[PDB]
Amino acid sequence: AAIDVVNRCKELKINALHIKLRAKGGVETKQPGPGAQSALRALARSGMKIGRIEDVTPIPTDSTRREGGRRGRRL
Amino acid sequence: PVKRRNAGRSQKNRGHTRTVPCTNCGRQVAKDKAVKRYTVRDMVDPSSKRDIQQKLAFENEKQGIPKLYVKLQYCISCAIHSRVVRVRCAEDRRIRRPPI
RNA sequence: GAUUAAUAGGGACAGUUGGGGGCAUUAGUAUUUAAUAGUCAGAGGUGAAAUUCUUGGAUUUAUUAAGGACUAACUAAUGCGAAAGCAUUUGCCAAAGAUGUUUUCAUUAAUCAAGAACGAAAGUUAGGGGAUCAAAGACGAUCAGAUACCGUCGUAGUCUUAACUAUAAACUAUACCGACUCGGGAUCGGCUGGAAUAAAUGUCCAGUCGGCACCGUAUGAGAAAUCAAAGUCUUUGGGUUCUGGGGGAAGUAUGGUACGCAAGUCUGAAACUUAAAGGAAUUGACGGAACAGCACACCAGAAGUGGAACCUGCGGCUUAAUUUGACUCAACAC
RNA sequence: CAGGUUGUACUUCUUAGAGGGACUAUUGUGCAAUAAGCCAAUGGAAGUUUAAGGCAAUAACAGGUCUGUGAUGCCCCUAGACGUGCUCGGCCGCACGCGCGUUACAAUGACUGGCGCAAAAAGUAUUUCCUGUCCUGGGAAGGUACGGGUAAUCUUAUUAAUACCAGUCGUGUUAGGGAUAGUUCUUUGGAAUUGUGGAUCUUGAACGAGGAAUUUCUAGUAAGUGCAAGUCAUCAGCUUGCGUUGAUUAU
Ligand SMILES: [Mg+2]
Ligand SMILES: [Mg+2]
Ligand SMILES: [Mg+2]
Ligand SMILES: [Mg+2]
Ligand SMILES: [Mg+2]
Ligand SMILES: [Mg+2]
Ligand SMILES: [Mg+2]
Ligand SMILES: [Mg+2]
Ligand SMILES: [Mg+2]
Ligand SMILES: [Mg+2]
Ligand SMILES: [Mg+2]
Ligand SMILES: [Mg+2]
Numbered sequence: 001a002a003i004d005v006v007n008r009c010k011e012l013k014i015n016a017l018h019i020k021l022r023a024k025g026g027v028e029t030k031q032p033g034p035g036a037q038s039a040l041r042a043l044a045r046s047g048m049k050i051g052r053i054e055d056v057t058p059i060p061t062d063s064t065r066r067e068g069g070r071r072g073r074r075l
Numbered sequence: 076p077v078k079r080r081n082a083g084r085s086q087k088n089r090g091h092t093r094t095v096p097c098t099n100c101g102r103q104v105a106k107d108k109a110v111k112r113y114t115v116r117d118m119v120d121p122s123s124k125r126d127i128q129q130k131l132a133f134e135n136e137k138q139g140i141p142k143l144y145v146k147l148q149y150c151i152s153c154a155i156h157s158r159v160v161r162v163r164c165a166e167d168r169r170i171r172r173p174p175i
Numbered sequence: 176g177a178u179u180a181a182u183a184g185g186g187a188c189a190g191u192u193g194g195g196g197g198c199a200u201u202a203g204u205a206u207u208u209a210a211u212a213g214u215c216a217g218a219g220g221u222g223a224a225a226u227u228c229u230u231g232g233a234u235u236u237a238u239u240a241a242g243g244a245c246u247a248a249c250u251a252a253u254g255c256g257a258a259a260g261c262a263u264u265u266g267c268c269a270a271a272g273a274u275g276u277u278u279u280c281a282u283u284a285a286u287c288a289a290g291a292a293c294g295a296a297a298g299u300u301a302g303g304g305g306a307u308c309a310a311a312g313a314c315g316a317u318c319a320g321a322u323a324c325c326g327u328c329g330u331a332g333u334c335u336u337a338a339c340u341a342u343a344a345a346c347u348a349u350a351c352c353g354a355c356u357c358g359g360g361a362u363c364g365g366c367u368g369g370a371a372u373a374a375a376u377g378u379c380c381a382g383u384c385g386g387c388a389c390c391g392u393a394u395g396a397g398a399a400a401u402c403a404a405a406g407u408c409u410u411u412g413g414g415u416u417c418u419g420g421g422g423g424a425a426g427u428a429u430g431g432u433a434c435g436c437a438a439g440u441c442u443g444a445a446a447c448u449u450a451a452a453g454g455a456a457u458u459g460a461c462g463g464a465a466c467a468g469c470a471c472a473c474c475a476g477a478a479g480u481g482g483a484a485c486c487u488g489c490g491g492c493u494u495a496a497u498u499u500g501a502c503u504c505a506a507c508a509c
Numbered sequence: 510c511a512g513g514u515u516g517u518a519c520u521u522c523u524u525a526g527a528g529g530g531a532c533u534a535u536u537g538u539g540c541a542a543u544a545a546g547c548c549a550a551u552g553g554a555a556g557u558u559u560a561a562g563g564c565a566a567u568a569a570c571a572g573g574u575c576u577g578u579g580a581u582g583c584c585c586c587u588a589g590a591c592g593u594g595c596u597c598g599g600c601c602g603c604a605c606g607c608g609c610g611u612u613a614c615a616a617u618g619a620c621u622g623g624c625g626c627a628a629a630a631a632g633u634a635u636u637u638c639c640u641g642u643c644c645u646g647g648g649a650a651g652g653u654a655c656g657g658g659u660a661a662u663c664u665u666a667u668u669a670a671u672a673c674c675a676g677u678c679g680u681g682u683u684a685g686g687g688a689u690a691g692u693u694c695u696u697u698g699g700a701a702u703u704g705u706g707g708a709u710c711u712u713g714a715a716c717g718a719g720g721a722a723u724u725u726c727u728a729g730u731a732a733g734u735g736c737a738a739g740u741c742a743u744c745a746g747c748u749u750g751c752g753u754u755g756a757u758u759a760u
């Protein structure tokens with residue numbers, strides 16, 4: 001994914017990306033998935049400069065109720 | 076056979092305490108009972124760190140990559156299974172400020 | 176001619192303290208949806224997947240808007256409330272403890288059948304509201320079977336007015352008022368001195384009153400687990416309500432000019448049957464828990480058996496007889 | 510280069526008695542909280558507890574054994590006996606299922622010659638046990654002609670087979686591979702038929718490297734290769750040992 005993106009910015013003449021990282025968030029998990037790190041790396045690995053980095057994950061001041069049971073996922 | 080005197084939750088001097096969904100499962104758990112650990116980690120594998128810190132456009136960064144802040148709240152089944160907390164002998168069971 | 180004035184109780188008052196309550200206000204992202212822009216082929220979800228959504232452009236990105244909830248992080252062996260319970264800003268309304276009193280009353284008190292006020296959730300009645308989840312249900316999957324755990328949906332519900340309902344592991348499973356018995360730091364709220372500074376709604380120190388607790392310890396208690404009460408109990412009596420008398424039958428039957436619209440609640444048996452049921456703790460054994468050892472167990476490899484013919488054991492099957500012991504390593508070229 | 514002799518001779522080789530030797534020795538600003546210990550290099554015949562074994566506590570498991578025992582309790586059979594013999598069968602009987610295993614599927618091979626390489630075991634109550642010469646037979650094997658040894662003396666300090674050197678054969682059910690068969694000959698045994706073994710011509714099958722599974726194994730080790738001993742009159746594809754050639758890979 002990353003290398004495709006980079007290849008395509010390269011022809012748009014784009015040196016540097018700012019990064020805004022996100023997990024599904026809100027009521028769901030706030031831990032970014034496995035692809036997070038790998039994509040961030042492979043982006044710079046591809047000779048793309050990297051600007052400011054922020055985590056924007058959606059963050060409830062407070063929540064609607066979670067998709068689990070009252071007892072969550074059993075098993 | 077009362078097992079814990081605490082009975083597992085830190086709550087006294089009140090009838091009721093707010094319930095929190097477990098990070099792992101989402102099961103409702105008492106906010107006192109919950110195994111809660113605050114995590115400040117880095118978004119990136121140290122190797123990956125080297126790679127990125129090469130390519131950082133603004134050289135004015137001194138540790139200019141953000142840390143990831145998590146307040147992690149586990150229901151008991153989860154924090155046991157997931158080894159966040161583990162079974163200890165009766166005497167140790169009451170030990171309060173343990174880590175390193 | 177009026178006893179003190181209880182480290183009794185009621186009242187007054189003074190600075191506080193609190194996530195106690197009721198009204199108003201008010202914010203905040205978040206979920207869901209819509210609008211307006213963008214861009215494209217995949218999004219979802221899982222152990223894999225499939226139901227779903229997608230070119231009528233989803234997921235995704237930016238900016239707004241609608242609509243119901245909910246108060247994250249700070250958030251704690253901290254606080255308040257009779258308990259249930261209570262966490263955004265501000266304003267209003269009444270209420271409360273503790274402390275402070277060389278204030279006032281003067282036994283006004285304790286506990287409590289009657290009788291009353293509350294009382295999570297779920298549920299019920301009549302309207303609203305409906306974003307999220309989500310019993311029932313519809314489907315996918317899983318499975319021998321799944322009407323289950325998982326996934327996609329989804330109604331009642333979840334929220335709200337008026338009303339009912341009265342129940343929980345409504346839990347410290349620990350009644351209330353009062354004494355007295357160890358030690359130690361810390362904590363929340365008052366007060367009293369003292370000290371430092373950058374001189375204060377902030378620090379520190381020493382007192383003390385009241386809270387929530389904790390840590391040691393008992394030549395006190397207990398069947399023990401444990402308990403600063405679960406102690407001051409055969410050396411048995413401070414005051415007062417409540418509850419139990421082996422296990423099931425059974426919170427069943429029945430009766431309630433007791434309740435409830437209903438669900439049901441409250442009250443509540445006996446016949447019959449039975450030798451134990453039960454509490455803590457010890458040691459084993461076991462575990463689809465955690466940790467730690469060791470072995471050619473694996474690591475890295477090799478020679479291979481299993482495939483073929485034959486040989487030699489077992490078992491079957493024939494037999495007059497096919498003598499017999501020995502079946503996971505721990506029988507079977509014994 | 511080989512024999513035969515020899516000595517107040519000698520100990521390297523060979524027996525094998527005494528005593529040495531190894532204690533993880535020496536070194537190590539190697540790891541060890543500097544303690545036990547581990548590690549490396551060097552020396553060393555030997556440093557995996559040197560190597561390989563023997564012995565094997567407490568407790569078990571109604572494990573196995575009345576068929577090893579003139580160790581037995583109890584039960585049973587007791588004269589056409591479940592006693593002690595003799596004759597013929599049987600345990601080896603075959604549609605099949607399951608184990609140990611020998612041999613192969615070949616070229617790192619098969620076959621034809623040549624080649625002074627072992628170790629460890631055994632051995633005669635006298636002709637009987639190992640057997641050396643010699644002779645006969647094409648052969649397995651037979652004579653009995655000359656002999657040794659109850660053995661460090663004799664069989665023998667040899668006689669093994671992989672291996673090596675020539676030569677044939679040429680990647681095909683081929684001489685790879687030989688199962689299965691039919692004649693002949695020999696040996697052990699009164700007895701060999703239901704082939705005891707061995708010899709000669711034939712005959713030549715499956716097998717072209719092996720499904721799911723799964724065994725053992727770390728150095729003179731695995732693997733290949735023969736040899737002995739037990740059994741035994743005869744019969745090793747077994748066992749228990751013995752050396753030869755010698756690895757891949759982990760400490
Ligand atoms: Mg889910
Ligand atoms: Mg409660
Ligand atoms: Mg809004
Ligand atoms: Mg709102
Ligand atoms: Mg507070
Ligand atoms: Mg309604
Ligand atoms: Mg199926
Ligand atoms: Mg849903
Ligand atoms: Mg002061
Ligand atoms: Mg005692
Ligand atoms: Mg008592
Ligand atoms: Mg205590």
Ligand SMILES: [Mg+2]
Nearest residue numbers: 408409411412
């Ligand atoms: Mg009494």
Ligand SMILES: [Mg+2]
Nearest residue numbers: 558560561562
């Ligand atoms: Mg030894």
Ligand SMILES: [Mg+2]
Nearest residue numbers: 570571572573
């Ligand atoms: Mg038995």
Ligand SMILES: [Mg+2]
Nearest residue numbers: 640651652653
């Ligand atoms: Mg002869």
Ligand SMILES: [Mg+2]
Nearest residue numbers: 631639664665
């Ligand atoms: Mg011999």
Ligand SMILES: [Mg+2]
Nearest residue numbers: 691701702704
């Ligand atoms: Mg014949």
Ligand SMILES: [Mg+2]
Nearest residue numbers: 704705706707
């Ligand atoms: Mg034959």
Ligand SMILES: [Mg+2]
Nearest residue numbers: 631639738741
């Ligand atoms: Mg013999």
Ligand SMILES: [Mg+2]
Nearest residue numbers: 508740747748
């Ligand atoms: Mg045998």
Ligand SMILES: [Zn+2]
Nearest residue numbers: 097100150153
């Ligand atoms: Zn959980």
